[PDB]
Amino acid sequence: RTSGAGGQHVNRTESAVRITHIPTGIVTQCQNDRSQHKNKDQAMKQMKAKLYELEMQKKNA
Amino acid sequence: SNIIKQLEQEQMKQDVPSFRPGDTVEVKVWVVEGSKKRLQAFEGVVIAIRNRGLHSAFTVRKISNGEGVERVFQTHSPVVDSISVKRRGAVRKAKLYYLRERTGKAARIKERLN
Amino acid sequence: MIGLVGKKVGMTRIFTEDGVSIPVTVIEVEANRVTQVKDLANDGYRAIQVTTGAKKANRVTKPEAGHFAKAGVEAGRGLWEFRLAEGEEFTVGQSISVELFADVKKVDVTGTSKGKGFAGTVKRWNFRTQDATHGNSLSHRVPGSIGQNQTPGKVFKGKKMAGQMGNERVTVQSLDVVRVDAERNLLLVKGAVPGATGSDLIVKPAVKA
Amino acid sequence: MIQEQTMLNVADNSGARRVMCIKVLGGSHRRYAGVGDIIKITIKEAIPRGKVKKGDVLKAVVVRTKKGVRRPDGSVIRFDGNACVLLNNNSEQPIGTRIFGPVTRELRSEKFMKIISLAPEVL
Amino acid sequence: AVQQNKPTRSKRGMRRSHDALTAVTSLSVDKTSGEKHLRHHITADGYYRGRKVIAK
Amino acid sequence: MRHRKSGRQLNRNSSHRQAMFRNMAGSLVRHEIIKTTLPKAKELRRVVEPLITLAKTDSVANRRLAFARTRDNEIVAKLFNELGPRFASRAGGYTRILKCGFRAGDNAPMAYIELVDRS
RNA sequence: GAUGUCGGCUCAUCACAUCCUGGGGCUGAAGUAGGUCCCAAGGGUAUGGCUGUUCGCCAUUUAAAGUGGUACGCGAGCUGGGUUUAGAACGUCGUGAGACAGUUCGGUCCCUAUCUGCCGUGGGCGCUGGAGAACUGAGGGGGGCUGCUCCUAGUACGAGAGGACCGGAGUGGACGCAUCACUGGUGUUCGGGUUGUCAUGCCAAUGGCACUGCCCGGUAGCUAAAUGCGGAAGAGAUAAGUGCUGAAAGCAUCUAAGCACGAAACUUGCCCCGAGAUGAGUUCUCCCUGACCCUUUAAGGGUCCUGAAGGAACGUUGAAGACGACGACGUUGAUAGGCCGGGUGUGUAAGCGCAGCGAUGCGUUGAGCUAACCGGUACUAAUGAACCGUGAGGCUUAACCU
RNA sequence: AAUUCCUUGUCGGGUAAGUUCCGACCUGCACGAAUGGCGUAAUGAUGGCCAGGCUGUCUCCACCCGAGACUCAGUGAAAUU
RNA sequence: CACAGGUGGUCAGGUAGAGAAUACCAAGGCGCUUGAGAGAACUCGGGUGAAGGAACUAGGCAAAAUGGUGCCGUAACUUC
RNA sequence: AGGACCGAACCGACUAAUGUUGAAAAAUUAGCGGAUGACUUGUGGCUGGGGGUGAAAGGCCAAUCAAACCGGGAGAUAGCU
Numbered sequence A: 001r002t003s004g005a006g007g008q009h010v011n012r013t014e015s016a017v018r019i020t021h022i023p024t025g026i027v028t029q030c031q032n033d034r035s036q037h038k039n040k041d042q043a044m045k046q047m048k049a050k051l052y053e054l055e056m057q058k059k060n061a
Numbered sequence B: 001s002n003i004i005k006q007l008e009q010e011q012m013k014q015d016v017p018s019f020r021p022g023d024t025v026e027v028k029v030w031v032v033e034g035s036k037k038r039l040q041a042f043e044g045v046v047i048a049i050r051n052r053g054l055h056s057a058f059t060v061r062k063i064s065n066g067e068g069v070e071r072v073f074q075t076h077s078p079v080v081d082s083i084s085v086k087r088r089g090a091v092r093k094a095k096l097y098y099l100r101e102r103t104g105k106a107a108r109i110k111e112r113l114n
Numbered sequence C: 001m002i003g004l005v006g007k008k009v010g011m012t013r014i015f016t017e018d019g020v021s022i023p024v025t026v027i028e029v030e031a032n033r034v035t036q037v038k039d040l041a042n043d044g045y046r047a048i049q050v051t052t053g054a055k056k057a058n059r060v061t062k063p064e065a066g067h068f069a070k071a072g073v074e075a076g077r078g079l080w081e082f083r084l085a086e087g088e089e090f091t092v093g094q095s096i097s098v099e100l101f102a103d104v105k106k107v108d109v110t111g112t113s114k115g116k117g118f119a120g121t122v123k124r125w126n127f128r129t130q131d132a133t134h135g136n137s138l139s140h141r142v143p144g145s146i147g148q149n150q151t152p153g154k155v156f157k158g159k160k161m162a163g164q165m166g167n168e169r170v171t172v173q174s175l176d177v178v179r180v181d182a183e184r185n186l187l188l189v190k191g192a193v194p195g196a197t198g199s200d201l202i203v204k205p206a207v208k209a
Numbered sequence D: 001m002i003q004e005q006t007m008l009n010v011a012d013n014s015g016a017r018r019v020m021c022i023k024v025l026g027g028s029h030r031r032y033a034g035v036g037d038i039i040k041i042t043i044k045e046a047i048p049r050g051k052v053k054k055g056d057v058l059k060a061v062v063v064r065t066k067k068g069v070r071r072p073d074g075s076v077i078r079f080d081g082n083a084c085v086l087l088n089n090n091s092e093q094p095i096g097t098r099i100f101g102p103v104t105r106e107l108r109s110e111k112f113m114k115i116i117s118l119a120p121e122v123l
Numbered sequence E: 001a002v003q004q005n006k007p008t009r010s011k012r013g014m015r016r017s018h019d020a021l022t023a024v025t026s027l028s029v030d031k032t033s034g035e036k037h038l039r040h041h042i043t044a045d046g047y048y049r050g051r052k053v054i055a056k
Numbered sequence F: 001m002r003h004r005k006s007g008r009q010l011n012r013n014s015s016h017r018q019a020m021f022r023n024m025a026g027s028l029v030r031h032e033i034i035k036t037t038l039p040k041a042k043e044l045r046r047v048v049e050p051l052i053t054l055a056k057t058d059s060v061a062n063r064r065l066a067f068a069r070t071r072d073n074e075i076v077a078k079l080f081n082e083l084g085p086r087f088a089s090r091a092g093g094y095t096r097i098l099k100c101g102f103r104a105g106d107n108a109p110m111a112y113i114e115l116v117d118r119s
Numbered sequence G: 001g002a003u004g005u006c007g008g009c010u011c012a013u014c015a016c017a018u019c020c021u022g023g024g025g026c027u028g029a030a031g032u033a034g035g036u037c038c039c040a041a042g043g044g045u046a047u048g049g050c051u052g053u054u055c056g057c058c059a060u061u062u063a064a065a066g067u068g069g070u071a072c073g074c075g076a077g078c079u080g081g082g083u084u085u086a087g088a089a090c091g092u093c094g095u096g097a098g099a100c101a102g103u104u105c106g107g108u109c110c111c112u113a114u115c116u117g118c119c120g121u122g123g124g125c126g127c128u129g130g131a132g133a134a135c136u137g138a139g140g141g142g143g144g145c146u147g148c149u150c151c152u153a154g155u156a157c158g159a160g161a162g163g164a165c166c167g168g169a170g171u172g173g174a175c176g177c178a179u180c181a182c183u184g185g186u187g188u189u190c191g192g193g194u195u196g197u198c199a200u201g202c203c204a205a206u207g208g209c210a211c212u213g214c215c216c217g218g219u220a221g222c223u224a225a226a227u228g229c230g231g232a233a234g235a236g237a238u239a240a241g242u243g244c245u246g247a248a249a250g251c252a253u254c255u256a257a258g259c260a261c262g263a264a265a266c267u268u269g270c271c272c273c274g275a276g277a278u279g280a281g282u283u284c285u286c287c288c289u290g291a292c293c294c295u296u297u298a299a300g301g302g303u304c305c306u307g308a309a310g311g312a313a314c315g316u317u318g319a320a321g322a323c324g325a326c327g328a329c330g331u332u333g334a335u336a337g338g339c340c341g342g343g344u345g346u347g348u349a350a351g352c353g354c355a356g357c358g359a360u361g362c363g364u365u366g367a368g369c370u371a372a373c374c375g376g377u378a379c380u381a382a383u384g385a386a387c388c389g390u391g392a393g394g395c396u397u398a399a400c401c402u
Numbered sequence H: 001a002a003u004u005c006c007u008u009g010u011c012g013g014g015u016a017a018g019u020u021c022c023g024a025c026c027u028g029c030a031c032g033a034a035u036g037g038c039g040u041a042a043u044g045a046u047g048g049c050c051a052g053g054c055u056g057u058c059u060c061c062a063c064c065c066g067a068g069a070c071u072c073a074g075u076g077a078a079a080u081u
Numbered sequence I: 001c002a003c004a005g006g007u008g009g010u011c012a013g014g015u016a017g018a019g020a021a022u023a024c025c026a027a028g029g030c031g032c033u034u035g036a037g038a039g040a041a042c043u044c045g046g047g048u049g050a051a052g053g054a055a056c057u058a059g060g061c062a063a064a065a066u067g068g069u070g071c072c073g074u075a076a077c078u079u080c
Numbered sequence J: 001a002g003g004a005c006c007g008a009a010c011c012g013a014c015u016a017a018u019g020u021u022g023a024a025a026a027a028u029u030a031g032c033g034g035a036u037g038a039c040u041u042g043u044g045g046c047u048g049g050g051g052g053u054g055a056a057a058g059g060c061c062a063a064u065c066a067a068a069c070c071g072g073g074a075g076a077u078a079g080c081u
């Protein structure tokens, strides 16, 4: 479930999505969208971005 | 009951002296360690006495090494060897639990002459 | 093995020579006396019915009297059976003493627990009270929910609720027998047994052992 | 009868003055720790220059309690306040070199033998 | 809180089954004054087990 | 539960109960018989009889005690000068309950309570 | 013409796709510890910090902190932090009224239970003459958790480091049952200190009121933090699995014939309820052994006598109890109260005397008082009766006795 | 930030552990100058956070005192159907 | 409603007290128009509580605590 | 001196539990704020319904308020039940 929002439907439904990398221990949350799926997509994208950034950081170091 | 009384009396020590509250008493107790019973002394003020025949007890307070210590002896236990009144105090109460929140010059209890 | 019917006298303690204070229940096991012997032939099972204590002659009923009379024994305060094991014989008149327990090390004691009357779920079932304050309305010691919604749509059987607590048969097991005394008809057992002072107590050799 | 949030005094000369029990160890849902029981503690008040430092999470053994300790004959022994000896997390043996105040026979065993030896009085 | 169906008269009757009064089994008769009374209570004239315990 | 506890509460607070027992006892002493509810009467036995007992030994201290208990000099006098010697031989049992039907106003079971050497 | 919403609390109950504990196969299983799959639902399965939170991160535990269903269980059971009215403000959008699954501060949560259900507890009738007991046990319920240490053994295993299976003993955690001997709590019914004030004519001494006026102790009871006990062993039939013998299939094969082992699950064993077990059971004991009418002649109805065993009722009552009930006793009597003696508790009463200018102190004095306790005692109350309950107990077969 | 969506931003403090709190940074979705900006002693039944003291708020409830609840007598409702 | 509500003015004793607060009393007036028992759960209104002391909780809500007169003494900051 | 301070009466109404077919159609008990002032209170008077009054909440205007109450137009109209 999401933080605050407004309604009965919102109270019940689990739209928020928290993706996590098991190897790295990185996480990405998303609860911008109403649609779970959309959130997941967004979250997934974020995760992907983060991985790239980590790879770049590693390269730099 | 009568039966219970009978059971109790045959276990009671007969040599227990006439101490009251306030009395500075010195209880000697049996202490096992390894395979040698020895006799540890515990000198303190008698703060409370509970009279129930065989179930009788008494609470001796002292100040060991800065820390206060109460010890409640079962009177007719064989773990206590010898009770002995090192001094006898003048108090007006049956129980001296006010001495728990009193130290040094405040915790003094005047000697009971005669 | 058979057991005896005693009476709870009270509790006390036995200081050992070493130092230890053993809390003992004192059970006055007066000489039980057999009133009837059962068997596989007539009754359908082996047992001994015994009686103990005295009873008022004016108060003992005719039927009660007759049963005792047949046995050839004084009327006691009650009758209690004991199932016999294989290789255990008893005549009808025979009087069994606490000397029987001399060899045993542990015993199960059985008697009617003290009656607490109508008890609530905090006492009776150890239910956790609700919050004493922080808004709570008339529901501090109340039992909470008693079921789920539409399924099943009923309270299940043996739901823990308030009700009569105690005044029922209970049995403490594996109580160590501290001392037997044929002189005064006493049995000392370590630790509290059920019931109040003066209550009857069936003492039996421990089944678990 | 120490529990989570109970502040004890320190018996040893480790450096700490006041320590709070954060965990009674040695069993799920274990409520209390009496004497000879190991507790996880955190240091709330310490001296300027000691071995231990403030906010240090480590183990300690309870050596006196206000609730007290019962003996076989039924003779209870109490103290004026709750106290403990700080221990290393791994080795489970005292930090300090010197134990203050009286302790008990309850504490004596192969584990806390150093402590008893140190102590001035053992009741 | 409240019934969903008016209960029947039969039901009511059943409920009231136990609402009946027991009359006194029998009255004791005083030995002296011969007047009836409740066991262990004095009479209306003031006797109890033969003797006159009370005036009026 | 209330195993082994003595003393009816009588739907009164303690002080009030005490007061009423003091009054009732006094009344009994005065009149040597009173009509009250049965439980009350029963309760009274454990107040009046003790007073009577106390009154047997006539001393100043005893008198004072009686006064404290009761607080009516006349009553005390009666106890010490009449009832004490009157019940001198008697070992307890100074009073007598006789059940006397049911009070009209509230069906409360009534009873006379009377001193044993009344008539 | 209303099916109240997230979370918390309280209570749960089921599923198994098992987190721990139990059994096993394979292992890239030496050991220790793992990985993986199969069986297994008996029991168990965390406290805190932060957030309204569920979730989650973190701290520290734990044998483990399972995953789900139950109106995402549970508001006629609680809460009301979030949400979901009306007040107000920020950001933002709008010319504006206002608006935003943006934020912020504030903000009434009703219901005496009819029926089902469930927890307890009685009355009626039945069970085939009536009654008092003791049982059997169909069936039902409860219980079932597990750590650490030590021994076996620094043995087996291993280059070392490390380090067992199996089996045994101890001592804990959590949970449950009982109990009050101990340690304690409470103890407005016991004793005492003490402030203000009113009263008892006054002094002295007492009582009332002030939350028990405020305190200090404390008996009985009830009690947990107090201290006893519990989980089992065993047996049976099995699960996955392991076999033995063994063909079909000359071999091989745990299976088809036949035989065996095999787990906290199942059935028992332990504890409790239990014959309304209408399939109403059994055993022991006690009690009643009279007339005549009557006719629609049958297990029919009536009237005189008779009234047992026992029961109830009434009373005194209880470590029994909401009320019923259950237990004890009712003068051939300790059932309750009182009384006597003791104990316990409080802590040296009042009065008198001495010392002191006095507050006060000392003596008489461990005094006085002392509830629910213990042991005794008929002083008071438990009444002689009366009431309900009857008068030998159906038919059909069989077997006996004669 | 009563304003920051992303966001529990990051760094520091405080705690064993801090989505709140305090101090910073500025990357101001979307502060900003009388629909005033930034400060501010004093005041507030104002919002948030931390400490001492205190505690049955809680661990975990226990006992007691009263008013109901329960039984007896008298009177005698209600929603609902 | 014989309803725990609301209703302006005047009078103003004693002892303690700063007091018209508070406590106990006077003068005077009342016991509140159902009682009697019993002493379960649970609810209400109170008392006490071993050890611990906010671990409760949305939040120390509620309780507990503090509490008087005199004298010493009292920081940051400040519009002094 | 004071829209100064502490605190009764008096005026209020921040928290709480109780009540919620109430003792009461907004109270109780325990605490709580103001208490020489922009105070409070008695008696009489004035403002009237798109009107009043409003230290502004759409508050209040006889238990009625985003347009009072009573009577009338009136059997408004009702593609709805």
Ligand SMILES: *C(=O)[C@H](CCSC)NC=O
Pocket: A007, A008, G084, G085
């Ligand atoms: C959602 O709109 C509603 C609450 C509105 S409160 C005016 N929820 C369900 O009824």
Ligand SMILES: [Mg+2]
Pocket: C115, C116, C117, F001, F002, F003, G320
């Ligand atoms: Mg009882």
Ligand SMILES: [Mg+2]
Pocket: C128, C129
């Ligand atoms: Mg709880």
Ligand SMILES: [Mg+2]
Pocket: C137
């Ligand atoms: Mg409410």
Ligand SMILES: [Mg+2]
Pocket: C136, C137, C138, J017
């Ligand atoms: Mg409440």
Ligand SMILES: [Mg+2]
Pocket: E004
């Ligand atoms: Mg319907």
Ligand SMILES: [Mg+2]
Pocket: E015, E016, E018, E019
């Ligand atoms: Mg009825």
Ligand SMILES: [Mg+2]
Pocket: F004, F005, F006
């Ligand atoms: Mg009694």
Ligand SMILES: [Mg+2]
Pocket: F011
């Ligand atoms: Mg009443």
Ligand SMILES: [Mg+2]
Pocket: F015
């Ligand atoms: Mg009073």
Ligand SMILES: [Mg+2]
Pocket: none
């Ligand atoms: Mg409908």
Ligand SMILES: [Mg+2]
Pocket: none
């Ligand atoms: Mg499976």
Ligand SMILES: [Mg+2]
Pocket: none
């Ligand atoms: Mg495996």
Ligand SMILES: [Mg+2]
Pocket: none
């Ligand atoms: Mg089993």
Ligand SMILES: [Mg+2]
Pocket: none
């Ligand atoms: Mg905190």
Ligand SMILES: [Mg+2]
Pocket: none
């Ligand atoms: Mg918080």
